């Protein structure tokens, strides 16, 4: 048979086969629960909704996210999403072939153990294993070595990899991602005069953000010219015909990402985080790492994020060493390409945690294979 | 050369002086317009009434609340109310004394700008300033730090403060106020048999609510007791002479305030959002905020809400976090007392917003300085 | 093992068996009592009359409508009407026939309790159940989404629903269906010269408005062209043989429906309340409801009401939202068709309210099962 990959992001879930350059299931991970008793008996079944249906209808029901900041909260919702992607989207049994999972760095070994235990108990899969988004994204990009900055929906992080050897005391992660971004966007929009407080409105403003949000180069001058002029602003149409306008929030939210002080979290930005992660290493490898800085994830899908990032890291670093940042247009599925190639190659086969190993030693064995 | 203050709450405006220790002028923020034609002459019948007049006579005209959910919609009506409260209530002049207005968090900067522009161009006030009701109530109570929870007829919200330092990331808002509460009460009365659809009937409903409605501790137990016995039923008198009976609505209304699901609003409860805001603060101030939690506003004047809130929050939060709710016997005017104190203070003088400063820079100074 | 349905309208009543596609026995829900004491002996005279008999011989009998604005006020007359329609027009014993009832959305729980208690005790039926005219009017067309605007003889309302889940926080009700309309028509006829104050005259006015009056599009333009050109004056014959001409009353009556100010109210027209109800709903269901908005009820049979309604709702609503109002023929019987379909559905059988439940938990069981 073949293999299978399924990355469970904080906001979305991307699952498919191996050896392919494009996934099949790309769908959001949200459980829909109606808020009304219902009076009609004809079409009133399917209490809980899963998949794109809960997005086509999101008003009469509340939406709950199973993963927050990369950590799982509701194992019930997680297994519901797994069953949906297995039997409804992929329409293939899990017992036939093994599947690959994903987990961000510094995540609880207890969460990894629960994941593998559920996978081997409920679905009764012959083999299983979990990987990291960073290594998969790097193997997808194909670069030899360097630093990788991956930012999903609710989690962001950067990690270096050189001479085929990871670095535990070099990773640097933060819980500031698209979630807090859309939260601050809702706040500044309430400041503007509109309002978005519910979950469906949260997803609507999330769509607005991922549609018409761009990053700036000089924050102060850009804000000044946006407050003075009114040519950069743009209008957006809501499904009910209502129209809204945005003149400064679009490029203020990226600055919010760059300046956590606005969110109130006393921490460092992504540029300072990368600089610190690099400094903790040895300069002889830092030199070659500066030129190899790959970006992945959806949060980094802004047009021009590479320009601001490279400018800031150059201002913070000496010009004696060449620097460069790369981010191909496929910043979203890169982890899926990495998983696909890793499942296609024959070496990692030996690393597949087999059902025999799990049932004879337990799930805690996963603490060593990481 | 004294000063004054005027809170423009959606429920009713309250204006007074700084040196005083209690407000002098107070009256509903309504505007009545006649709907009929009128035949008799010589009575000096006007075309738009405001203040206690529209309250004394309300069955011959339609009422309008210009401020809804803390947002102004009828600037002409607001100007009329300001003229009435500056000239009729207390015989004074605006050009002779500086004013001090108040607003709620997240209020539109456009609203603030229009407010200050009207106050400057129409009345030619020497100086003015805008603040937040939470810090006002804090200065009134005399404390410095703590978490304020205000709930007026317009909207409700809560915010923490630490040694005068605010935390916008911790601010939380909600649009569950006396308006929707009275609407739900009228709906439940219609379900009971009594009908109330008009504006004068809505005012009678607000009155009977503030007179009878009381919150309970165990909603299910109280509902069972009401459905079983009848000792809880009360009787109210109307201007028509006939009386009406009320059962469980008196506590179902505050329960709707606590459970927005009863009204059909997808959001969190007051205790839930309070705990969420508290959790978004720092661990070294979590405890100081738990004990120094103060409530304000007129809507929170329900009897038995302090014990209910305390029980809910202490059952939701862990132990060794002793709580002490501050719900003094006087809270409807606490914001006015704090405003008077701040105006009488010495340092606050230098923080005024003058007329020449606005004419030079513009109205944007209001949101640029405070 | 068959079923039975009986829709009790404020003005009319239609009962019969299920399965069919049209009602069996429809007649006015009135009670005529003789006012002129003393009759010619030997011939015999009845005590009270009901059904078409009263309308056939009414010059000597005073009429009474036991229902007002959807609420019951004469339980004796209601029981008499039920007996007449169950024993004479159909000649069927209800002891072996489960019946079905109807009721406006918001009505006295005590009224519903008394209705179910009467139907259970004074008839010894196997089971029964109640419903809302909106749900049945929707089932008639079969569609499951959208909003429905019903308008009977004394009560009107609008109710949305999406995928079977109804939004109780958006339902709206009003007491302008045909009764205040008939009263205003009497008033305008008196203004023209013709007097109509009795009950037989009220039925005559009901007939003349059912046959002649119709709504317009531009009220002012139509009034102008009617006052200038005498092309709209239409003649109507009376039972005696006279003839009466009518002009702008045909416009003023629906205009009074749209503008209750002519009747002495402050509420807004059907369009304004419909837009308000749709506003309280979420944005996606707002869009989905703008398209499928159905109108039903006897009052809805005014020629030219759909075009004017959609014109007004579009003028007061934003653009880019197609508003396709629907109003199929035989809509005044849509409630009956929906009730018949529901009774025919096999699943709905399990929702029947049997006699054991009433004998055990009393009549209040109606609420829990509803």
């Amino acid at each position: 048979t073949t293999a299978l990959v399924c990355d469970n992001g904080s906001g979305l879930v991307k699952a498919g086969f191996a050896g392919d350059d494009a996934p099949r299931a790309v769908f959001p991970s949200i459980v829909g629960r109606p808020r009304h008793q219902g009076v009609m008996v004809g079409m009133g079944q399917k209490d809980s909704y899963v998949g794109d249906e809960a997005q086509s209808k999101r008003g009469i029901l509340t939406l709950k996210y199973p993963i927050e900041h990369g950590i799982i909260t509701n194992w019930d919702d997680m297994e519901k999403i797994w069953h949906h992607t297995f039997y409804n989207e992929l329409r293939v049994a899990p017992e036939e072939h093994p599947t690959l999972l994903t987990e961000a760095p510094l995540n609880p070994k207890a969460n990894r153990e629960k994941m593998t235990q559920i996978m081997f108990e409920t679905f009764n899969v012959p083999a299983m294993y979990v990987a990291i988004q960073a290594v998969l994204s790097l193997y997808a990009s194909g670069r030899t070595t360097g630093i990788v900055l991956d930012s999903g929906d609710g989690v962001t992080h950067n990690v270096p990899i050189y001479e085929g050897y990871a670095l535990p005391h070099a990773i640097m992660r933060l819980d500031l991602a698209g979630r807090d971004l859309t939260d601050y966007l809702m706040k500044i929009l309430t400041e503007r005069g509109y309002s978005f407080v519910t979950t469906a409105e949260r997803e609507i403003v999330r769509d607005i953000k991922e549609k018409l949000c761009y990053v700036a180069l000089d924050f102060e001058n850009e804000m000044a010219t946006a407050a003075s002029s009114s040519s950069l602003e743009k209008s957006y149409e809501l499904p009910d015909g209502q129209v809204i306008t945005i003149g400064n929030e679009r490029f203020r939210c990226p600055e919010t990402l760059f300046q956590p002080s606005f969110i109130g979290m006393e921490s460092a930005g992504i540029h300072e985080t990368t600089y610190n992660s690099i400094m903790k290493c040895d300069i002889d490898i830092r030199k070659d790492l500066y030129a190899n800085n790959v970006m992945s994830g959806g949060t980094t899908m802004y047009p021009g994020i590479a320009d601001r990032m490279q400018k800031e890291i150059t201002a913070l670093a000496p010009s004696t060493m060449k620097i460069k940042i790369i981010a191909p247009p496929e910043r979203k599925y890169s982890v899926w390409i990495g998983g696909s190639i890793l499942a296609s190659l024959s070496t990692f086969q030996q690393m597949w945690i087999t059902k025999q190993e799990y049932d004879e030693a337990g799930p805690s064995i996963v603490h060593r294979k990481c | 050369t004294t000063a004054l203050v005027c809170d423009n709450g959606s429920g009713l405006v309250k204006a007074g002086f700084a040196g005083d220790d209690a407000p002098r002028a107070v009256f509903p923020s309504i505007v009545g317009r006649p709907r009929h034609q009128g035949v008799m002459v010589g009575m000096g019948q006007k075309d738009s009434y405001v203040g206690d007049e529209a309250q004394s006579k309300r069955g011959i005209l339609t009422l309008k609340y210009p401020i809804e959910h803390g947002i102004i919609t009828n600037w002409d009506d607001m100007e009329k109310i300001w003229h009435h409260t500056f000239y009729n209530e207390l015989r004074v002049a605006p050009e002779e004394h500086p004013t001090l207005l108040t607003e709620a968090p997240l209020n539109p900067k456009a609203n603030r700008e229009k407010m200050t522009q009207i106050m400057f161009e129409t009345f030619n006030v020497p100086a003015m300033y805008v603040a937040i009701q939470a810090v006002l109530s804090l200065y009134a109570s005399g404390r410095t730090t703590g978490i304020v929870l205000d709930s007026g007829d317009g909207v409700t919200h809560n915010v923490p403060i630490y040694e005068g330092y605010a935390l916008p990331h911790a601010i939380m808002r909600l649009d569950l106020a006396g308006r929707d509460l009275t609407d739900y009460l009228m709906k439940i009365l219609t379900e009971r048999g009594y009908s109330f659809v008009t504006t004068a009937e809505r005012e009678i409903v607000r009155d009977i609510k503030e007179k009878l409605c009381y919150v309970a501790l165990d909603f299910e137990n109280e509902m069972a007791t009401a459905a079983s016995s009848s000792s809880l039923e009360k009787s109210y008198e109307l201007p028509d002479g006939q009386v009406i009976t009320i059962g469980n609505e008196r506590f179902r209304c505050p329960e709707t305030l606590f459970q927005p699901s009863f009204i059909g609003m997808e959001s969190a409860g007051i205790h839930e959002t309070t705990y969420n805001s508290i959790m978004k603060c720092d661990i070294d101030i979590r405890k100081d905020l738990y004990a120094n939690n103060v409530m304000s506003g007129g809507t929170t004047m329900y009897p038995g809400i302090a014990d209910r809130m305390q029980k809910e929050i202490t059952a939701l939060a862990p132990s060794t976090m002793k709580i002490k709710i501050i719900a003094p016997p006087e809270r409807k005017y606490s914001v006015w007392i704090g405003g008077s104190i701040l105006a009488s203070l010495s340092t606050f003088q230098q923080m005024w917003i003058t007329k020449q400063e606005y004419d030079e820079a513009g109205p944007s100074i209001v949101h640029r300085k405070c | 093992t068959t079923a039975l349905v009986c829709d009790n309208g404020s003005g009319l009543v239609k009962a019969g068996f299920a399965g069919d596609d049209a009602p069996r026995a429809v007649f006015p829900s009135i009670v005529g009592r003789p006012r002129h004491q003393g009759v010619m002996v030997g011939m015999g005279q009845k005590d009270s009359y009901v059904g078409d008999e009263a309308q056939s011989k009414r010059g000597i009998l005073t009429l009474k409508y036991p229902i007002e604005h959807g609420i019951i006020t004469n339980w004796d007359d209601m029981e008499k009407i039920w007996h007449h329609t169950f024993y004479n027009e159909l000649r069927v014993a209800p002891e072996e026939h489960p019946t079905l009832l109807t009721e406006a959305p918001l009505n006295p729980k005590a009224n519903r309790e008394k209705m179910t208690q009467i139907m259970f005790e004074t008839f010894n039926v196997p089971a029964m159940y109640v419903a809302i005219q909106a749900v049945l009017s929707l089932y008639a067309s079969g569609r499951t989404t959208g909003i429905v605007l019903d308008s009977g003889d004394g009560v009107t309302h609008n109710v949305p629903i999406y995928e079977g889940y109804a939004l109780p926080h958006a339902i709206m009700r009003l007491d302008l269906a045909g009764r205040d309309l008939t009263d205003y028509l009497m008033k305008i006829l008196t203004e023209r010269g013709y007097s109509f104050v009795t009950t037989a005259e009220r039925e005559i006015v009901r007939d003349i408005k059912e046959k002649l009056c119709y709504v317009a599009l531009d009220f002012e333009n139509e009034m102008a062209t009617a006052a200038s050109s005498s092309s709209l004056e239409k003649s109507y014959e009376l039972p005696d043989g006279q003839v009466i001409t009518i002009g702008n009353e045909r416009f003023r009556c629906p205009e009074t429906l749209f503008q209750p100010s002519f009747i002495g109210m402050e509420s807004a027209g059907i369009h304004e309340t419909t837009y308000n109800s749709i506003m309280k709903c979420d944005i996606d269901i707002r869009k989905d409801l703008y398209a499928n908005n159905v109108m039903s009820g006897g009052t809805t049979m005014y020629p030219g009401i759909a075009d004017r309604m959609q014109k007004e709702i579009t003028a007061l609503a934003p653009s880019t939202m197609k508003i396709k109002i629907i109003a199929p023929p035989e809509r005044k019987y849509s409630v009956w068709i929906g009730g018949s379909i529901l009774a025919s559905l096999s699943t709905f059988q399990q929702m029947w309210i049997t006699k054991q439940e009433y004998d055990e938990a009393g009549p209040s069981i109606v609420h829990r099962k509803c």
């Binding site: 005069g193 509109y194 309002s195 978005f196 407080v197 409105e201 809501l238 209502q242 809204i244 | 809804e68 959910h69 947002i71 919609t73 649009d175 | 506003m279 944005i283």
Partner: peptide, 7 residues
């Protein structure tokens, strides 16, 4: 309702 969009 008075937020130029939602509510």
């Amino acid at each position: 309702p008075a937020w130029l969009a939602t509510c």
